[PDB]
Amino acid sequence: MFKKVLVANRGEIACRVIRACKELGIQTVAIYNEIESTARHVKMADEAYMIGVNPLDTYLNAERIVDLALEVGAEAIHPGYGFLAENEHFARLCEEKGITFIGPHWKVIELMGDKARSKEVMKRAGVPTVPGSDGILKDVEEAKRIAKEIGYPVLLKASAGGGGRGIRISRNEEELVRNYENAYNEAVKAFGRGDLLLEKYIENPKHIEFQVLGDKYGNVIHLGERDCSIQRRNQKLVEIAPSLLLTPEQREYYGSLVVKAAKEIGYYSAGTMEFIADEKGNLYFIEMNTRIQVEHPVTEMITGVDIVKWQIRIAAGERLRYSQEDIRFNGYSIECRINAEDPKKGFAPSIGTIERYYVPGGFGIRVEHASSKGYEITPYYDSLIAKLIVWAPLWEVAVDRMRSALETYEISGVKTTIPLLINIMKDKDFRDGKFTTRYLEEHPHVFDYAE
Template structure:
C-alpha cells in the first residue's frame, strides 16, 4: 500500500485550509498553490510550502493542469487533493495525475466520466432499479420526436444540459409553444458553459425537495452511506443552507435512499467520497438526480452527525486502506445546520458584492464551526465564487440547532461588504423552515427584500442604548430646569462684569 507523506491541495480559500488542517493532524506535509489574488491568503501561510501559479483568472492559475502536475513532481508530492470546484471533477486531470505517478485523492477517471454526464449516469444506474425521473435517455436530436416525448410525459417539462450543473443549461417549459425557444436557449447556454450542447428532457416536478446522500467507498468494494443532507434552501438552483438529517426523511425512507445511493456508487465502481443527489416530490417519492464525484461544500454537517472526518477517510482510501467501519456501526448523533455566508446582497436579488472586509469577527462557542479562508482587512476577489465562509452549528436536536444558528449569526460581525447572514437569520426564524415544510421554492414563495430589516451587532446595540439613555437624561424636565438655571446665572454674571 502506498504511504502518503506529502499532498498538494489543488484549490484555494476555505476548502484548501480545511483540508490542510486534517492533513496537519495526520502528520502529512502540505503544499498550497495560489494566484496573485490569493497571495496573502490564510491557506498559503498555513501550508508547509506554497507555489505561485499566475494571475487571478482561474484559466491562468487554478485550472493550469500541466503546470500543477509539473510543480507537484518537482516538489516530490505523493498525492493531489482537488477539493471541490476547479479540477475536482475533471476526468482528464485525474488521469494525467495518475499517469505521472501521483495519487489522485478521489475516484477513478472512469467514475468521474460516467457520473459527469447525466445521460451516461442514468444509463449506468438503470440496471439497479433506481428510481429515475420520467424523461429521455438520449440527447435531443429530433425536434418533432422530442415534442412528442414531452407531450407523453406531460407539461411542465425540464430541458437539462447533460454536462450541466449549478442550474446552467436548464430551462422549464410550461407549454408546447415555448418548447422551441427554451430548447434553443438551453443548448446555447450548455455549449457556452460546458463546451457540450447535449440536452435531454425530464418531467418537471413541482415543489421538489433536494435531498442528497453522502457515500464512502474503498478500493476493496466496501461502500457505506452516511445518511442524508437536506439542501432545499436554494437561490438560482444553488444551495444556501443545508442540514442533516432532513426533517422529513423517515428511518425507512433513509434506508431506501441510502441503499439506492450505494447502488449508484456500485454502478460505476466508485471509491472515495461522493454524494448521490435525489429530487423528492410532495409525496416523498425520490428520484435519482446526479452524483457529485468529490467532497461537497456541505460535508461538515455530515461530519458533525457521524463523528467522521471525511478528508481523513479520503486520504486513507487513497492509500488503499479498507474502510474501518461498517454500515451498522454508523449512527446519527444530533443535528447540524450549515449556512453559506456569501458576499451577496439578498436585498438586490443576491447580486455578488466585492470589497474589503473592514470588520470580520467570527462567532464562538460549543457546537459552532466556521470554515473560511479570509481574515479582517482582506479583499473579496471578483474572480472566484463569492462565498466568504461556511457557518456550521451542531446541537442535540433540530430545534436547539436552529436557535444556536441564530445566536451564531448574531455573533458574526462582518462590515465592508454585503452578505447573506441576515437572509440566513430570516430563514431560521421562518415558520416554514422551522416546521420542516419547505421546498426548493422557499425564496420564491416567501422571501421579499423588505423582509430584511437593518439589524445591529451586540456592540452597536450597546452603544445605541447608552446614547439613547444619555439623550433621555438630557431632555428630562430636571435637566431643562438645571440648564435654564445655569443660563440665568451666566447672564447675571455677564451683567455684573459690564457694570464693573
C-alpha cells in the same frame, strides 16, 4: 501514508484539506496566485508556490500543477471542490505521472460527468430516475399512455434544438394532446423535426442528496442525506442533515440503492447523488458530484465521520473500517453559507475588504473559514467568507443555535448574507420544516432587514 500532499485549491476548502493533512502528520503544499500572496491557505501550508498567469489559470492549468507536484515531491493531490476536482483529464494526468489523485478513478469522473450517461448508469443500477419516455416518443398515442403511467403533470420538449423552443406543461390528457401537436409543429418549423420527449413534472420539489464513501477494495457505505432545498440561482445557501422529509426506513432504502450503484461503477473516495423530491418522499436522481461538497460538514456532525480525512486515508490505500451498521445519525445539523454578496441587490458580490471580523464559537458550533480582518473579496473568485455549522439533538434547538450564532457573527467592510440568514432562522415555515427549492421566492419577508 503519503509523506506529502499538494492542495490544488484555495480558501476554506484548501484550509479544510490542510488541517486534515496536518492531523495525519502529512506535509502540505499550497499553490496561489500573486494577487493573493497573503492567503490563509498559503500561511497554513508547510510550503507554498505562486503559479499561473492569471488568478484562475493558477488553479485550472492541470499540466502546470502536476509538474509542480513532481518538482516538489508531492505524492498526491487533493483538488478540493470546483476548479479541476471533476476534471477527468487532470486526474488521468496525475495517474499517468505517478501522483495519486485524492478522489475517484478518472474513468468514473468521466462517466459521471455526462448527465445523461449518469442517469442511464443509475437507471440500470436500480436507482430511481425521473420517469418519462425512453428517448423520442413514437407518437401521441404512446405519449398518452406513458403519461398516464407516470402521472400528471408531465413535460414535453423537442428532441432537437437545445431548447430554442421551450417546454410545455400538461395537467391532463386534453392538454397533453394539444401540447403535443403544438410542440411538434413548432419543432418542425424551428428545427425541421417534430420529435418530442416527455418526462414527469416534479412541481415545487425539494433538493435531497445522499453521501457515499468507498475504499479501493469495494467497501462502500452511505452517510445519509442532506436537504439543500434553500438555494438561490441554483446556489445553495442553507443545508441541513438529515433531511426532515425521510424516515429512517426511507433513508436506508434509498441509501442502500446508492451504495449498490456506486459499488457497480467501482466508485471510491467521497461522492454525492443529488435527487429531487416530492411531498411523499419520492426521490429521483438528477446528478452525481464526484468530489467532496461544500456542505459536507453537516453530514460529519451527525455521523461523526471525518470525510476529508477518510478521502486521504482511502487514497493511500487504507480500508474503510466501518460497515453500514456502524453508521448512526445523531441529532440535526445546519450549515449557512456566509457570502460576501448583497441579498437585496440580486446577491451581487460585495467586493472589498473585511474590516470588523468576529467569528462565533461555542458548544455545538463549528466554523470553516479562511478569513481575517483585511481579507479581500475579489471578482476573480467565489464570494464565500465562511461556513457556519451547528449541531444539536433536536431540530428546534439547532435552529435556535444557528440563529444565535449568526446574530453574533460580526463582519463589516462588505455586505453579506447574514441578516437574510437570521430572518430565515426566525421564519415560522423554516422552523416548521416546510421549505422547497422555491422557499426564497415564497418568503420575500426574509429580505426585509434594515441597512
